[PDB]
Amino acid sequence: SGPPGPPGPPGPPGARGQAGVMGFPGPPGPPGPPGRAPTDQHIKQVCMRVIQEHFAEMAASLKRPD
Amino acid sequence: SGPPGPPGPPGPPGARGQAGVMGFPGPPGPPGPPGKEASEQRIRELCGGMISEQIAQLAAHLRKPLAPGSI
Amino acid sequence: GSGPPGPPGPPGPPGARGEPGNIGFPGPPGPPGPPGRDATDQHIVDVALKMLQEQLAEVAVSAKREALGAV
């Protein structure tokens, strides 16, 4: 005989969930800056160098009308 | 005596799992494109005159002067 | 008649398992690539030499045609 006892305590917390998935990797970086193109002044300077390194050749052809 | 009391209620849900870590960095980008070459036309524009002038100057040096130039 | 109330009941069952962890954030982009290669001087050199060859050849043509009166 007698009334049931008091209710038991709440149960223990459930198990912890699994770790989350790693994020996707990032995209590739942008392509680099373009290489440099010749300026007008740079073009002129190369032509000047070529001419100056070819005076002997120029002179050979300037005698040729003889 | 009376019987044991009823069971307690269920325990709370377990904690959420550890957060996923951040993704890897992406790779470096590729090299930029090559510099654009000057056109042959623009080279002829910039250098035609100096070639002509130096040719005429050398012809005078050699005492073989050319047909007269343009004014 | 009545005996005493029973003892306290047992603990309730364990709570539900927790959820999986939150999704990781995306990784950063990679760095920009290295600079592209600069245009080299060769294309300019090549055209300059062609112009020189052309203009020098024209000196001989002019001299010859001057003598002929066919310029």
From Swiss-Prot, chain A:
Post-translational events: Covalently linked to the telopeptides of type II collagen by lysine-derived cross-links. Prolines at the third position of the tripeptide repeating unit (G-X-Y) are hydroxylated in some or all of the chains.
Location of the region described as Nonhelical region (NC2) in the Swiss-Prot/TrEMBL record: 38-66
Annotated compartments: Secreted, Extracellular space, Extracellular matrix
Family the entry assigns: Belongs to the fibril-associated collagens with interrupted helices (FACIT) family.
Pathology noted in the entry: Multiple epiphyseal dysplasia 6: A generalized skeletal dysplasia associated with significant morbidity. Joint pain, joint deformity, waddling gait, and short stature are the main clinical signs and symptoms. Radiological examination of the skeleton shows delayed, irregular mineralization of the epiphyseal ossification centers and of the centers of the carpal and tarsal bones. Multiple epiphyseal dysplasia is broadly categorized into the more severe Fairbank and the milder Ribbing types.
Subunit architecture: Heterotrimer of an alpha 1(IX), an alpha 2(IX) and an alpha 3(IX) chain.
Function: Structural component of hyaline cartilage and vitreous of the eye.
Domain comment (free text): Each subunit is composed of three triple-helical domains interspersed with non-collagenous domains. The globular domain at the N-terminus of type IX collagen molecules represents the NC4 domain which may participate in electrostatic interactions with polyanionic glycosaminoglycans in cartilage.
Protein name: Collagen alpha-1(IX) chain
Gene (name only): COL9A1
Shown residues in whole-protein numbering: 754 to 785 of 921
UniProtKB/Swiss-Prot annotation, chain B:
Post-translational modification as stated in the protein's UniProt record: Covalently linked to the telopeptides of type II collagen by lysine-derived cross-links. Prolines at the third position of the tripeptide repeating unit (G-X-Y) are hydroxylated in some or all of the chains.
Region listing for Nonhelical region 3 (NC3), in residue ranges: 38-68
Top-level taxon: Eukaryota
Subcellular location(s) per record: Secreted, Extracellular space, Extracellular matrix
Subunit structure, interactors included: Heterotrimer of an alpha 1(IX), an alpha 2(IX) and an alpha 3(IX) chain.
Disease (UniProt): Multiple epiphyseal dysplasia 3: A generalized skeletal dysplasia associated with significant morbidity. Joint pain, joint deformity, waddling gait, and short stature are the main clinical signs and symptoms. Radiological examination of the skeleton shows delayed, irregular mineralization of the epiphyseal ossification centers and of the centers of the carpal and tarsal bones. Multiple epiphyseal dysplasia is broadly categorized into the more severe Fairbank and the milder Ribbing types. Intervertebral disc disease: A common musculo-skeletal disorder caused by degeneration of intervertebral disks of the lumbar spine. It results in low-back pain and unilateral leg pain.
Biological function: Structural component of hyaline cartilage and vitreous of the eye.
Family of the protein in this entry: Belongs to the fibril-associated collagens with interrupted helices (FACIT) family.
Protein name as it appears in the record: Collagen alpha-3(IX) chain
Organism name: Homo sapiens
Residues of the full protein shown: 517 to 553 of 684
From Swiss-Prot, chain C:
Similarity comment: Belongs to the fibril-associated collagens with interrupted helices (FACIT) family.
Residues of the full protein shown: 517 to 552 of 689
Disease in which the protein is involved: Multiple epiphyseal dysplasia 2: A generalized skeletal dysplasia associated with significant morbidity. Joint pain, joint deformity, waddling gait, and short stature are the main clinical signs and symptoms. Radiological examination of the skeleton shows delayed, irregular mineralization of the epiphyseal ossification centers and of the centers of the carpal and tarsal bones. Multiple epiphyseal dysplasia is broadly categorized into the more severe Fairbank and the milder Ribbing types.
Gene from which this protein is expressed: COL9A2
Stretches the record annotates as Nonhelical region 3 (NC3): 39-68
Name used for this protein in its record: Collagen alpha-2(IX) chain
Locations listed in the record: Secreted, Extracellular space, Extracellular matrix
Posttranslational mods: Covalently linked to the telopeptides of type II collagen by lysine-derived cross-links. Prolines at the third position of the tripeptide repeating unit (G-X-Y) are hydroxylated in some or all of the chains.
Record's function text: Structural component of hyaline cartilage and vitreous of the eye.
Complex and partners: Heterotrimer of an alpha 1(IX), an alpha 2(IX) and an alpha 3(IX) chain. The chains are linked to each other by interchain disulfide bonds. Trimers are also cross-linked via hydroxylysines.
